[PDB]
Write a protein that binds this DNA or RNA. Sequence first.
RNA 1: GUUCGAAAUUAGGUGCGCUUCGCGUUACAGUUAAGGCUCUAGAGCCUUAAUUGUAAAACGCCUAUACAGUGAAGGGAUAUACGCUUGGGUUUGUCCAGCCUGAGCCUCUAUGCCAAAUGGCGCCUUCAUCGUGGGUUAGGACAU
DNA 2: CATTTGACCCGCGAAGCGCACCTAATTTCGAA
DNA 3: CGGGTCAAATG
Length: 446
Amino acid sequence: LGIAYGGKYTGLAVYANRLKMRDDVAGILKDRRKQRGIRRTAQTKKKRLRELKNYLKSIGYNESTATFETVYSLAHKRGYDYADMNSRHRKEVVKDVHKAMIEGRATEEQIKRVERIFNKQYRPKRFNNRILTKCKVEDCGVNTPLRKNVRDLLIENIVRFFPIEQSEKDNLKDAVLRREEVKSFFRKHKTDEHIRKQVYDIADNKLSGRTVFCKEHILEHTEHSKEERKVFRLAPSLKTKIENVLAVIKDEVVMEASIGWRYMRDRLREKKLPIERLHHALDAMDKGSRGSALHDRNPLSYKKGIITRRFMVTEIECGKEDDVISETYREKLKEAFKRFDTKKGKCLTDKEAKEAGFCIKKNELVMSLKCSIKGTGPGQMIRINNNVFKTNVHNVGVDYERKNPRLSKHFIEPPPTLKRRDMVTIKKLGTSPTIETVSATKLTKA
RNA sequence: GUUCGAAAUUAGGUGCGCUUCGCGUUACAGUUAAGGCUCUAGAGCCUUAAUUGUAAAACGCCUAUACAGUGAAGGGAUAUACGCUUGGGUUUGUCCAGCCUGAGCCUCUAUGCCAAAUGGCGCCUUCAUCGUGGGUUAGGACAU
DNA sequence: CATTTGACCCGCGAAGCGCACCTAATTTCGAA
DNA sequence: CGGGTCAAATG
Ligand SMILES: [Zn+2]
């Protein structure tokens, strides 16, 4: 093998071929997770609002009444409850709800049910039993316990090696799980400081995670010492990296980033391969995919042929203020940059915007300016519900460009067989695709 | 006695999943503040910006045998499910991740909250009732 | 009038829970 | 952070 991997690169120094691994999948999953969290928060907000509306209408506070107005507006921003006394606390929102429903002449049971709606848990929190480490011995596929549920077994695993009799071992085990008793025992039955910490840690600490062995095998681990450490749960991004490297190996070991070492070591054997744990070889993405974003995350405004969007003054770049629609605020922003000298950093800053007089919002917060969107065109605009989005995956091929079947019903501009990366006699696609900085129209299939 | 292997423990980092709280975006509607034009100091319209409210945030796919509210009763560690067995939806060229989830079950895993036993509560179940919902999707491989 | 050709575009923050998989170190037991 | 966008410019 000779594989050696590190940082963003790897080398199969059997051969001396270097390979570049994907160093993005982690950040892509991170934002595929932030998006899912945003979506689920919004769905729970809709659930809660539906329930609150139904209840308020059921008790005579119909939508036209001020009680409904106030309570429904309060239910949009209910505050946080992870702690107790950028957001208000659940208690302040519920205090305002009580105030409004009292002023509405509501009964105690009604206010209490509205409070229950404001405190309801719409999606269960399930985290106590999610990741399931199975027992290491080959004949025991059963679940290992959480280490906090078998503190007795873990304490026994340590006390079974003390120079004392079994009766004193059992007494000590029962005492530590009787506080000064264990201290006196150790003070008399001199024991190593590390062993004493370990037993105290098992007795007292918050034991996250599971044990390598089940109940029936925690103590028997010495009988299985020759079996190496096993792995079952590796990060999908590291899995993608390592499996791309392994696929390269399959098409075509002192393996010196260290995470996931055992997963490679086990895939390299797939039975007994030994392991000895830009010039890297000398030391030794497809955004059109079916799971990529169909469009941008921030919707755009598309009015009478002009694409614009609101960007904060601290989000509009120096040298680009010409996209700001307002003539007056363009001049104001230019008057701000010939004092700020922001051309280097180009980002501008909250303090600078406030000093320049762009703090116009409710909380003295920096205003926003509508700016025209460069780098986009009409062909990329889609409309879903009220939102207009830029889609970078509008092109799936060219026959005249071919529109994305997942967006044909949403394109604002009506439409008038080389796919991307095909071999022809393609890095960017269109009616005259870019083929490799040369662009041509008369490509032919090859 | 060195080395190596395992387990345990601790700290760091990396990452994965769940549940929320916001800001920002967008659509409409109402206001305020200006800028302009147009009718005639006002009045009508367009712009920008602020402030209010409500609504959308991937497309889709799958579910009404579904889903949630309310009430009653029963069960609640001889119990349930995030567990086990075995699925199904997302799901498509195909296969997956991840999430969700049905039926049976308690051999492994887990089991919360408010008040020493015990007591409520969440929880599970059946029914009655008003109904209109719920899950997943912004990732990876392969083929094309 | 098809090509270069050069600049431009792209959602952020926090909290509460779980978890694994690698480093660093120690104990203990097994071996080779 | 590729896949485009526009307008410009041997054209
Ligand atoms: Zn076992």
